[PDB]
């Protein structure tokens, strides 16, 4: 329907102009680890995440424009599924890492960040993505999504004892985590410089992207344990927890010096 039809237009216009802006948050990030800050590691692992999945939308908008629900028999809808995964929980991570660092800088005494170089770094972006790919599988029984205008991700088995409870797992552990260490790391940025309007634009950048979804697949799962019109919705939050991509280096390339630096460096 038609809270199915905008997403494909947004989508029009998302992978155009949003694969620039993540090339150059990139070479941003590098010139500041060349320069030794601690911080433009994660920006790299952002912008890598971002540029892998950017490049992965003629699959996903593909069967979500071609009214393709299961186009492939087995192979659409798992490898689809894994994408979506990946794709949101990475975001989450490295926003949620980037926050904590410049908590840690901007308000954290010398204690704990002196001893935190670009070796640190380097360390802890390796350990989320070893545990975004090793430990997502296991706790998906190894037969994840099935049968299913259905989008991807998108299917219809009764959620069982593999789909339901664990659907509140990850509602619980991939959105009030992260959203809690964000809100805490800026109540307590405030708590000292009282830089501080960035610093809070990626709590609510991850909300208005991650947190719809959460909160409605908590409804899907609640209704059960304890869908004719209420599924054109799923749509729009998916489009939302797709267009978080686009959002996000609007936000992080705020500090007016690094527009100059990028356009000098391409023209």
């Known amino acids: 329907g038609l809270d199915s039809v905008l997403p494909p237009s947004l989508y029009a216009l998302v992978f155009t102009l949003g694969l620039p802006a993540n090339l150059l948050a990139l070479w941003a990030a590098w010139l500041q680890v060349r320069k030794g800050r601690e911080l433009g590691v994660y920006l790299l692992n952002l912008s890598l995440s971002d540029l892998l999945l950017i490049c992965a939308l003629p ?38 890492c980037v926050s904590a660092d410049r908590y840690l800088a901007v308000a954290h005494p010398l ?94 950048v991850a909300l208005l992207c991650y947190g719809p979804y959460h909160a409605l697949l908590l409804l899907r799962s609640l209704v059960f344990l304890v869908e004719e019109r209420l599924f054109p919705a799923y749509h729009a939050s998916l489009a939302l927890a797709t267009l978080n991509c686009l959002a996000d280096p609007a936000l992080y390339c705020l500090a007016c010096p690094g527009a100059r630096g990028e356009v000098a460096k391409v023209v």
Do not use: Q
């Not at 979500?64 to 990475?90: E, I, K, Q, S």
């Open 59 to 96: 699959p996903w908008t593909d069967y979500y424009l071609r009214r393709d629900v299961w186009g492939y028999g087995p192979g659409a809808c798992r490898l689809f599924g894994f994408v979506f995964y990946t794709n949101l929980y990475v975001g989450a991570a490295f926003l949620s």
């Open 111 to 204: 204690r704990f960040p002196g001893a935190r170089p670009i070796r640190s770094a380097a360390a802890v972006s390796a350990l989320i993505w070893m545990l975004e790919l090793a430990a997502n599988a296991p706790p998906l029984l190894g037969e994840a999504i099935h049968r299913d205008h259905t989008f991807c991700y998108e299917s219809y088995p009764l959620s069982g004892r593999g789909a339901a409870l664990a659907n509140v797992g990850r509602v619980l552990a991939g959105f009030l985590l992260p959203w809690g260490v964000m809100m805490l790391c800026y109540a307590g940025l405030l708590r000292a410089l009282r830089v501080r309007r960035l610093a809070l634009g990626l709590p609510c």
